[PDB]
Amino acid sequence: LGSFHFDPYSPAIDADPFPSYKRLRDEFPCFWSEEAQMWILSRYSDIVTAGQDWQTYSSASGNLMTELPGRAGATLGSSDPPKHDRLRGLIQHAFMKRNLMALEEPIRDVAKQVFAQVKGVKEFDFKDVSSQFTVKVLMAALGLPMGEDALVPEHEVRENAVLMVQSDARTRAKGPEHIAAYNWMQDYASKVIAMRRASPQNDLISNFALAEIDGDRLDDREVLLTTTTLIMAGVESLGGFMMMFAYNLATFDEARRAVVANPALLPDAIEESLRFNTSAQRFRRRLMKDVTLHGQTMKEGDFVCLAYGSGNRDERQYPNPDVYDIARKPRGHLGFGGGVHACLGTAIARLAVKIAFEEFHQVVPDYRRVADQLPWMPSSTFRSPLVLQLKAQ
Ligand code: HEM
C-alpha cells in the first residue's frame, strides 16, 4: 500500500489519467511501469525530444501501446525512415492532388444528415452520431462507396470499421473478431482499389494509385495498406476526439455558449481540446541504444511510452494546464504527436471536427452531460467515453 504504479491497462487510467500523469512528471519523469513493461515519458520537453529522435526511439516495432500483428514495412505508423518517408511523401502527394479542403461539401453534407437525427431529442448518446459521422467522413475522403444502396451497404462498412479498431477489454489486445473485421476491410478495400484503378475518380484511393514522384509509386501492398491504415487510424482517433470535444463543451458552459454564438471560435476551441485531452493519449517506441534520462538507465531494446496526453498537461509548457481555456490558442501541442509520424490526418481532422460541430450546434445549440461519472473506453493508447449521454438544455 502506498507504492506508486502507472498501469495503462487499468480502468482507473482510462477514466482519469491526469493525477498519475502529474506524479510521473513531478516525481518519476522516466518511470519503469512493471504492468506495461516499458518506460514512461511524461514531461513535454522529454516527449518532444524523444519523438523527434526517431533514430533512438524507433517506431518499427509498433507505435500502439498494444501490439499490431501485420506488415509494418508497408505502414507509416510502425515504420522508420527511410521507408517511412518514401511512403509518407507519396501519400502526401496524393493528398495534395485531391485537395483535402475540397472535402468541405461532402463532409458538411454528412454532418447535416447525421446530426439531423438528434433534432428535438430530449436525451441522446453522442457516440452514435459521432461514430456515424466519423466513418462516413473516412468513406467520403477515401472514395469508399456510400449509401445503403451501395453494393456493400454503408452500415456494414461502419460495423466492421468500428469493430476492427476495438480491442478486448480485458487484455487490451485484439481478438479473433477484431482481426476478422480487419481482414474483411482489407478485402473490401481491395475491391474498391481495383475499381478505381480501372476508372479513377475524384477521391483519395484513386490518387494513391496515380501518385508518382520521379518514377516512384506505391506498390500493390502499399496502396492497400495505406487505405486500410488510414481507415484504422481515422476511425479510432477522430471518433474518440469527436467525443472528447463534445464532452468538454458539455462540461464547460461558457466555452459552449461562446462557440455556439460565434462558430468562428471553433478552430481555437478544437485546438484547446486537443491539448487538454487528445483522444490519442499514449504511443510507444523502442530504444535503439542505451539512454540515460533523469538518472534512469534505459537500455537498448526496452520500450518507451510517449504520453502525449501528459506532455500537454505539463505546466512547464502551458501555464495553468488543467484550465480549459478556448482562448489559449495553444501552439506546439502534442495532440497529433510530433516529428516524422505527426498525424497524417491533421488537416482532415481539423476540418471535419469544425464542420461537424458547426452543424451539430445548429441542431442542438445547448446541451449538458447527463452523467457525473461516465464509463470510459478500455484502451492502452486512446481515451474517450464509452457513452456520452447528452441532454438538450
Ligand atoms: C482528432 C483526430 C486525430 C487525432 C487526435 C490523431 C492523433 C494522432 C497521433 C497522436 C499520431 C501519432 C502517433 C505516433 O506518434 O506514433 C497520429 C498518427 C497518424 N494518424 Fe492521426 N489522429 C487523428 C485523426 C486522423 C485521421 C482522420 C487520419 C486519416 C484520415 C489519421 C491518420 C494518421 C496516420 C496515417 C498516422 C501515422 C502517420 C505516420 O506514421 O507518419 N489520423 N494521429
Numbering used by the authors: 3 to 395
Paper quotes:
Here, we show that the natural α-diazoester azaserine can be produced by Streptomyces albus engineered with a previously uncharacterized biosynthetic gene cluster and act as the carbene precursor for coupling with intracellularly produced styrene to generate unnatural amino acids containing a cyclopropyl group, which has wide applications in organic synthesis and occurs frequently in medicine development, by a reaction catalyzed by an evolved cytochrome P450 mutant with its native cofactor. To incorporate an abiological carbene transfer reaction into biosynthesis, an appropriately engineered enzyme capable of using azaserine as the carbene precursor was required. Because the activity of P450-T2 was the highest among the enzymes tested in the initial screening, the activity of this enzyme was further confirmed by in vitro reaction with purified protein.
In the initial screening, E. coli cells expressing the wild-type (WT) P450-T2 and a CYP119 mutant exhibited both significant activity and different diastereoselectivity compared to the control expressing the red fluorescence protein (RFP). Although the diastereoselectivity (dr, the percentage of the major diastereomer versus the sum of all diastereomers in the product) from the reaction catalyzed by whole cells containing P450-T2 was 87.8%, it was 99.3% when the reaction was catalyzed by purified protein. To guide the directed evolution, the crystal structure of P450-T2 was determined. Based on the structure and previous studies, several sites around the heme binding pocket and on specific loop regions were selected for site saturation mutagenesis and evaluation for the activity and selectivity of the resulting mutants. The first-round mutant (S239V) catalyzed the reaction to form 46 times the amount of product as was formed by the wild type enzyme. This site corresponds to the T268 residue in P450 BM3, a site that has been reported to be important for increasing the activity of P450 BM3 toward carbene transfer reactions. The third-round mutant (S239V, F338H) was about 5 times more active than the S239V mutant. Aside from catalyzing cyclopropanation of styrene with azaserine, P450-T2 WT and P450-T2–5 also catalyzed the insertion of the carbene unit from azaserine into the sp3 C–H bond of phthalan.
